[PDB]
Write an enzyme that holds these catalytic residues in place. Structure first.
Site, PDB file in Angstrom:
ATOM      1  N   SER A   1       0.845  -1.193   0.000  1.00 42.67           N
ATOM      2  CA  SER A   1       0.000   0.000   0.000  1.00 42.67           C
ATOM      3  C   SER A   1       0.889   1.255   0.000  1.00 42.67           C
ATOM      4  CB  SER A   1      -0.975  -0.092   1.191  1.00 42.67           C
ATOM      5  OG  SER A   1      -2.023   0.833   1.077  1.00 42.67           O
TER       6      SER A   1
ATOM      7  N   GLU B   1      -9.238  -5.984  -2.820  1.00 41.97           N
ATOM      8  CA  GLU B   1      -8.695  -4.781  -2.203  1.00 41.97           C
ATOM      9  C   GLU B   1      -9.752  -3.828  -1.631  1.00 41.97           C
ATOM     10  OE1 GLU B   1      -5.603  -3.956  -1.902  1.00 41.97           O
ATOM     11  OE2 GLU B   1      -4.512  -5.194  -3.334  1.00 41.97           O
TER      12      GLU B   1
ATOM     13  N   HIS C   1      -7.419  -6.356   1.375  1.00 35.04           N
ATOM     14  CA  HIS C   1      -6.248  -5.586   1.484  1.00 35.04           C
ATOM     15  C   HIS C   1      -5.417  -5.882   2.720  1.00 35.04           C
ATOM     16  CE1 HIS C   1      -4.023  -1.893   0.524  1.00 35.04           C
ATOM     17  NE2 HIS C   1      -4.175  -1.485   1.779  1.00 35.04           N
TER      18      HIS C   1
END
Ligand SMILES: *[C@@H]1O[C@H](CO[C@H]2O[C@@H](C)[C@@H](O)[C@@H](O)[C@@H]2O)[C@@H](O[C@@H]2O[C@H](CO)[C@@H](O)[C@H](O)[C@H]2NC(C)=O)[C@H](O)[C@H]1NC(C)=O
Ligand SMILES: *[C@@H]1O[C@H](CO[C@H]2O[C@@H](C)[C@@H](O)[C@@H](O)[C@@H]2O)[C@@H](O[C@@H]2O[C@H](CO)[C@@H](O)[C@H](O)[C@H]2NC(C)=O)[C@H](O)[C@H]1NC(C)=O
Ligand SMILES: *[C@@H]1O[C@H](CO[C@H]2O[C@@H](C)[C@@H](O)[C@@H](O)[C@@H]2O)[C@@H](O[C@@H]2O[C@H](CO)[C@@H](O)[C@H](O)[C@H]2NC(C)=O)[C@H](O)[C@H]1NC(C)=O
Ligand SMILES: *[C@@H]1O[C@H](CO[C@H]2O[C@@H](C)[C@@H](O)[C@@H](O)[C@@H]2O)[C@@H](O[C@@H]2O[C@H](CO)[C@@H](O)[C@H](O)[C@H]2NC(C)=O)[C@H](O)[C@H]1NC(C)=O
Ligand SMILES: *[C@@H]1O[C@H](CO[C@H]2O[C@@H](C)[C@@H](O)[C@@H](O)[C@@H]2O)[C@@H](O[C@@H]2O[C@H](CO)[C@@H](O)[C@H](O)[C@H]2NC(C)=O)[C@H](O)[C@H]1NC(C)=O
Ligand SMILES: *[C@@H]1O[C@H](CO[C@H]2O[C@@H](C)[C@@H](O)[C@@H](O)[C@@H]2O)[C@@H](O[C@@H]2O[C@H](CO)[C@@H](O)[C@H](O)[C@H]2NC(C)=O)[C@H](O)[C@H]1NC(C)=O
Ligand SMILES: *[C@@H]1O[C@H](CO[C@H]2O[C@@H](C)[C@@H](O)[C@@H](O)[C@@H]2O)[C@@H](O)[C@H](O)[C@H]1NC(C)=O
Ligand SMILES: *[C@@H]1O[C@H](CO[C@H]2O[C@@H](C)[C@@H](O)[C@@H](O)[C@@H]2O)[C@@H](O)[C@H](O)[C@H]1NC(C)=O
Ligand SMILES: *[C@@H]1O[C@H](CO[C@H]2O[C@@H](C)[C@@H](O)[C@@H](O)[C@@H]2O)[C@@H](O)[C@H](O)[C@H]1NC(C)=O
Ligand SMILES: *[C@@H]1O[C@H](CO)[C@@H](O)[C@H](O)[C@H]1NC(C)=O
Ligand SMILES: *[C@@H]1O[C@H](CO)[C@@H](O)[C@H](O)[C@H]1NC(C)=O
Ligand SMILES: *[C@@H]1O[C@H](CO)[C@@H](O)[C@H](O)[C@H]1NC(C)=O
Ligand SMILES: *[C@@H]1O[C@H](CO)[C@@H](O)[C@H](O)[C@H]1NC(C)=O
Ligand SMILES: *[C@H]1O[C@H](CO)[C@@H](O)[C@H](O)[C@H]1NC(C)=O
Ligand SMILES: *[C@H]1O[C@H](CO)[C@@H](O)[C@H](O)[C@H]1NC(C)=O
Ligand SMILES: *[C@H]1O[C@H](CO)[C@@H](O)[C@H](O)[C@H]1NC(C)=O
Ligand SMILES: *[P@@](=O)(NCCC)OCC
Ligand SMILES: [Cl-]
Ligand SMILES: [Cl-]
Ligand SMILES: [Cl-]
Ligand SMILES: [Cl-]
Ligand SMILES: [Cl-]
Ligand SMILES: [Cl-]
Ligand SMILES: [Cl-]
Ligand SMILES: [Cl-]
Ligand SMILES: [Cl-]
Ligand code: NA
Ligand code: NA
Lengths: 527, 176, 352, 176
Positions: free
Chosen positions: C21, C148, C261
């Site tokens: 990320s 995600e 995620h």
């Protein structure tokens, strides 16, 4: 208060508000010993160096030169005349930096044109503070010797070796190599840029080994050294140096004597005789230009071009749509800035005599033949347009296109543009179209200044040009990547793609002036 | 857009507005007038003729595409209406060859040349004018999409007519 | 590490950066930053890259935010070195406490204080630097997880809960777009609805729930990682792309939230190799294999597992766009992940 | 040779390694070993290369063998620098005499003590280094003989003799 220390001493600059921001200008920093007295006619010499602080808070003197007095009071022409005193002591450059001082900026170095006989880096259309404000590059420009005082040659003789002004340009590029990191510049990212003779100059620095390591890339506006006015043959050069000697009663037998004599004449007297070193001349005469001196230029440059001997790097080359128009009102019978210049066939023929002085009769008919068979014989401005095309295509367009082809054939990426916007503020008449010199102001960013009476469409064109030029300089690719812009192809021998610059849509086209440059380029050189 | 796109979701219509009305720049008064003519030309005629020709050329045969841009000196509709629908026909049929008839020289010349390209296509499958040093008309291929422009001045080879607009009509719009 | 690692036995000439990320976004900007260019050899990008819409702050918004912060801590000044000097006096808690409000609307994916083009670490807009091929030339391994976008929905989207199955309605989906796309023309938002809600078919109740997770994954992570990798591969270097689709047997969030995620990280670090720890056999096996692909990339620039008859991982090229899927069953070579969706995010959306 | 050969007239910049069987295997590993990478130019491989099944010992078997050796020379210890310190006291003949048995079954092609991945000469399994192109880039000449396997049959395969023609049966082949 902004002081920066240089190899040669300290210099103070001045702050400038530009578009709600600030740029720091250092105007008139000297860059060689003044070339006076024993120095007149010689290569520029080492700047000796000062304690104390130089103030670089005004433009310095322009080099000595003749002025254009064809249209006194007319902005069209007078905007090109120098705008600081003339003086032999004219070897100074300007630097414009973004504020805050950048960290490792790309450097644009402008070389002005002027036919090698005129020009000055302090013209308003060459003001580097828009570029530095908007793209946070650094901009450097230099005054360099022009006319006999910069290009007089008596070959082999170092008292007057030729190409003096080209080595003043060169010593300025050395000065940026040595000093620019102090102002925040990257000496490893330098792009030379220039128009007309300044473009020709850029092109010869590509051929000159002594320049090869003082810059990274090159921009060529309306000019390249294979233009027919850009290089003087060794023959004509001595003829001219001695015709000058004659005319100033300096003919001698010892050549270091002719020079020693000439080094005594007052400036005005050399200037005053320059025009006549030559029997016929024309509105595009270059009486004192670059020559093959065995030093800056080690062989005929056409050979060096053909055989691939030149700096390998990317080039951006372009021409304006009506290059040839501006020179017609300096001598072609029938032409005026003050009416629409519909000339006749017989007038066109006379025009060729003015522009092609010596110049076999068959030469001249063959130009008529090429340019005057139309579709169709009806339109009254047929002959008027044809004469501008002869002059544009011959003098600027075909030679810029052939430089770029020969250059691209050896391997490097080139980009070619075709500028076709007429400035809403142009002071010359309509019939004269998209004239020579009139892209400069778009490239420098003048139309970004809202306060200034350019159209919206013009600001937009400018902002986009400026971004393509600054992308070329930093990245070697002139794209505008953000605003969905037409992608600029590289120019290759084969498809010969170019991009058109106008306020409406910009297009990819092919083979600019194909039929015309086949004439100039293969056949004409033979007559 | 309501007149031309009757039923016609609201999002359909905004998306046409969105595509056609973001300009360079908001200044020119005839901005909206030109945009509506383009919506209608590109949607109804230009993008579909270009997609026919691409799909058709993809299977093997030679195609030629032209882009007619001469306004008839005798056109009776107003200037703002430009190079209108229907107004090539008379050039193709040869009407301007009739001198007696008030067309320009340049127009007779354009006509004589069109007529010869059309008659060469018909007999030979290739629309060249071979005699009078004319610009050569490339075949149109999926890939470069070359076309020839027809006007009284110079005729040019260009690429990808209405590229950004037909991407709208052709991929996105058919979905609304 | 350049200066000191050889003392611990390290090769400073073989360094791979890796990150997830914002840490992936970071890795991507070190690829663009000249000052980093010689402090590492290669790069791994997990669920992140600097062209994601949350990853870089414009100079405009940045000063707005710095001064909104000044305001909020009564530090507005006229001398800017004064605003800072002031701000350098506030206690930590007070800066932290006002960060959230330096900004009028915000969203579950807000990044109020991020990277900016400072003329120093980052010398130009990075999208330009990317397009024009100005970045470290070396191999990259990029990937994204299959769901995600799910994790951010339970932070603000009406109808969503970790504690039930979040079947939202059409009107709720529309409201969701308001939360995730704050300002955000109405036509912008309808066009997302239009793209994501025409299905096959109108029957399934969790239609709207899945669509909102996809808007958010594809927009925020998947399409930008895929476009980074294409632009990057176009200049010459080998890239590898993966598509992680295993849901951790130990995941504490609900089923509907899928392969979330952040939830590859533990496979990459080797946590499931620890038998003592309640992961499946199949999970240990997946982990051991990932770990070996990552360590092969780092040392060799190629993420193969060469010993255990493993599916060969193709390089990603602009043209075929091949990627490898990571799951406990068979791993596959596929093509053009999210082709229709990224055509929306990538060509059309940036215009609204 | 790098340091000294120029004194005898040699070019240290032109060195070819050459070798047969384990010596070829050796040459092949110098191609993989970074510490060798600059001590030679090219490589010849006669009847041998490190991916042969007898050429590299796994770390597993290697410790098994080192400790089986320790055992057999009564040197089993608990401190490993102690096993070695012990082993460094045995006479040569005693180490040699036990080598054959560090291993339960063995064969005529046994290699009880060979190259291993030590993290030093050989930084990873060499099959991985091979596959992933990590090795000196230079030319190689490799070869094999037509009957490589024959010589080892008279060391243990039932039916085989150098002193007759060894026509074995199917059941003998199976035993082989
Ligand atoms: C090389 O120069 C000669 C020199 O001629 C000139 O004398 C100079 C001082 C200058 O004033 C100049 O204008 C003057 O002409 C050129 O010779 C001349 O050529 C023309 C036509 O060829 C004749 O009509 C002149 O009478 C003749 N002058 C003299 C004094 O000989 C010569 O032409 C030139 N070379 C070239 C190719 O231009
Ligand atoms: C356009 O002007 C040219 C330019 O010459 C003149 O400028 C005019 C405005 C004119 O009134 C006068 O002040 C100046 O000479 C005109 O050509 C000129 O015409 C005369 C015949 O009178 C020639 O013998 C002149 O030398 C000639 N000038 C040039 C440059 O050769 C031209 O006729 C005029 N044409 C128009 C109005 O269409
Ligand atoms: C740039 O910042 C201004 C500042 O507005 C803010 O004041 C800050 C201290 C902070 O508390 C913040 O939440 C508050 O809004 C933003 O202006 C605001 O814009 C909205 C809608 O545009 C209005 O409803 C507010 O009343 C208005 N506030 C003020 C005091 O002017 C501005 O929006 C922002 N820029 C962007 C693009 O987000
Ligand atoms: C799934 O839960 C959401 C989440 O909101 C709630 O969490 C629940 C478990 C609920 O019992 C309550 O404690 C908490 O508010 C439910 O949506 C909520 O429904 C109400 C109407 O009562 C709205 O006005 C709430 O604001 C709304 N919450 C959110 C996040 O907007 C949702 O209805 C529930 N759905 C199921 C069981 O399918
Ligand atoms: C790793 O070594 C053990 C050790 O076994 C040996 O003891 C050594 C000192 C040596 O004398 C050796 O010949 C002897 O066998 C091996 O274990 C043996 O395995 C076989 C069959 O698997 C059994 O029949 C033996 O009884 C058994 N011995 C003992 C004492 O445990 C082991 O096999 C070996 N690993 C491999 C894969 O070869
Ligand atoms: C070829 O010789 C093998 C080898 O064994 C023997 O060498 C011979 C020359 C033989 O006379 C004897 O000195 C020695 O044992 C012969 O195989 C042998 O046959 C016997 C049965 O007598 C087996 O029980 C032996 O173990 C076996 N030897 C081996 C190596 O397993 C083989 O029969 C012989 N064959 C011929 C002549 O074709
Ligand atoms: C500043 O950057 C230096 C080199 O940058 C250039 O690489 C060149 C070959 C050319 O392509 C330029 O356009 C590139 O930008 C670097 O070596 C210096 O060390 C740098 N110094 C700094 C950051 O202050
Ligand atoms: C350790 O190895 C050094 C270099 O190894 C690397 O080559 C790089 C360019 C990069 O590809 C890495 O991944 C390679 O492994 C070598 O020059 C040193 O001298 C070595 N020092 C030791 C062995 O202690
Ligand atoms: C001896 O020759 C030297 C180098 O020769 C070699 O070049 C290598 C790269 C390799 O290809 C060899 O096979 C070539 O033969 C040279 O640099 C030395 O200076 C020489 N010294 C002498 C002649 O005594
Ligand atoms: C240079 O300019 C500065 C700026 O005001 C001034 O203080 C200094 O005396 C100047 N020196 C000159 C003109 O020699
Ligand atoms: C991008 O276009 C915008 C208007 O949409 C304007 O702010 C600017 O002129 C553009 N940037 C560049 C480099 O042209
Ligand atoms: C060829 O051009 C001539 C004039 O040179 C004219 O007679 C005729 O219009 C032309 N032929 C064709 C097919 O265009
Ligand atoms: C190879 O598979 C074996 C089981 O056959 C196992 O020991 C290990 O997980 C594998 N090695 C790698 C890198 O996956
Ligand atoms: C000509 O005479 C002078 C002597 O003062 C000198 O400067 C020049 O070099 C001489 N050259 C010759 C040999 O003619
Ligand atoms: C503003 O005032 C202070 C003086 O202490 C200083 O720190 C800052 O640089 C000043 N800048 C200006 C010129 O406004
Ligand atoms: C074991 O004992 C000896 C002490 O003399 C030593 O050589 C060896 O390193 C020791 N290692 C440990 C910590 O067991
Ligand atoms: P350029 O420098 N070259 C023309 C040659 C005379 O511009 C002249 C106006
Ligand atoms: Cl006509
Ligand atoms: Cl454009
Ligand atoms: Cl043309
Ligand atoms: Cl406008
Ligand atoms: Cl034509
Ligand atoms: Cl178009
Ligand atoms: Cl369904
Ligand atoms: Cl697999
Ligand atoms: Cl997909
Ligand atoms: Na001819
Ligand atoms: Na759309």
């Amino acid at each position: 208060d902004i002081i920066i220390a240089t190899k040669n001493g300290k210099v103070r600059g001045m702050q400038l508000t530009v578009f709600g921001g600030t740029v720091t200008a250092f105007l008139g920093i000297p860059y060689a010993q003044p070339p006076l007295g024993r120095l007149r006619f010689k290569k520029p010499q080492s700047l000796t160096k000062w304690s104390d602080i130089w103030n670089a808070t005004k433009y310095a003197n322009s080099c000595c030169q003749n002025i254009d007095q064809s249209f006194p009071g007319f902005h069209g022409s007078e905007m090109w005349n120098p705008n600081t005193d003339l003086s032999e002591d004219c070897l100074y450059l300007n630097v414009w930096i973004p504020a805050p001082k950048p960290k490792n900026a790309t450097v644009l170095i402008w070389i002005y044109g002027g036919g090698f006989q005129t020009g000055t880096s302090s013209l308003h259309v060459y003001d580097g503070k828009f570029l530095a404000r908007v793209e946070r590059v650094i901009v450097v420009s230099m005054n360099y010797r022009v006319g006999a005082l910069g290009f007089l040659a008596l070959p082999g003789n170092p008292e007057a070796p030729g190409n003096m002004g080209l080595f003043d340009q060169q010593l300025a590029l050395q000065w940026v190599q040595k000093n620019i990191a102090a102002f925040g510049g990257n000496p490893k990212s330098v792009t030379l840029f220039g128009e007309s003779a300044g473009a020709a100059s850029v092109s010869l620095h590509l051929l000159s080994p002594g320049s090869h390591s003082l810059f990274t890339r090159a921009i060529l506006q309306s000019g390249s050294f294979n233009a027919p006015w850009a290089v003087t043959s060794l023959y004509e050069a001595r003829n001219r140096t001695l015709n000058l000697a004659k005319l100033t009663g300096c003919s001698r037998e010892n050549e270091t004597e002719i020079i020693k004599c000439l080094r005594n004449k007052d400036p005005q007297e050399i200037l005053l005789n320059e025009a006549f070193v030559v029997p016929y001349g024309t509105p595009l005469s270059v009486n004192f230009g670059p020559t093959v001196d065995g030093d800056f230029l080690t062989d005929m440059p056409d050979i060096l071009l053909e055989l691939g001997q030149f700096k390998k790097t990317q080039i951006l080359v372009g021409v304006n749509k009506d290059e040839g128009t501006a020179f017609l009102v300096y001598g072609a019978p029938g032409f005026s800035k003050d009416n629409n210049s519909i000339i006749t066939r017989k007038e066109f023929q006379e025009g060729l005599k003015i522009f092609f002085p010596g110049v076999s009769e068959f030469g001249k008919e063959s130009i008529l033949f090429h340019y005057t068979d139309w579709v169709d014989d009806q339109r009254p401005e047929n002959y008027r347009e044809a004469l501008g095309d002869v002059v544009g295509d011959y003098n600027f367009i075909c030679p810029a296109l052939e430089f770029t082809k020969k250059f691209s054939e050896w391997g490097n990426n080139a980009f070619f543009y075709y500028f076709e916007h007429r400035s809403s503020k142009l002071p010359w008449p309509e019939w004269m179209g998209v004239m020579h010199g009139y892209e400069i102001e778009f490239v420098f960013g003048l139309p970004l200044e809202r306060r200034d009476q350019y159209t919206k469409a013009e600001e937009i064109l400018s902002r986009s040009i400026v971004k393509r030029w600054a992308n070329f300089a930093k990245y070697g690719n002139p794209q505008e990547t953000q605003n969905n812009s037409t992608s600029w192809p590289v120019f290759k021998s084969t498809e010969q793609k170019y991009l058109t610059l106008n306020t409406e849509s910009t297009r990819i086209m092919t083979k600019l002036r194909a039929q015309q440059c086949r004439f100039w380029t293969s056949f004409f050189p033979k007559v």
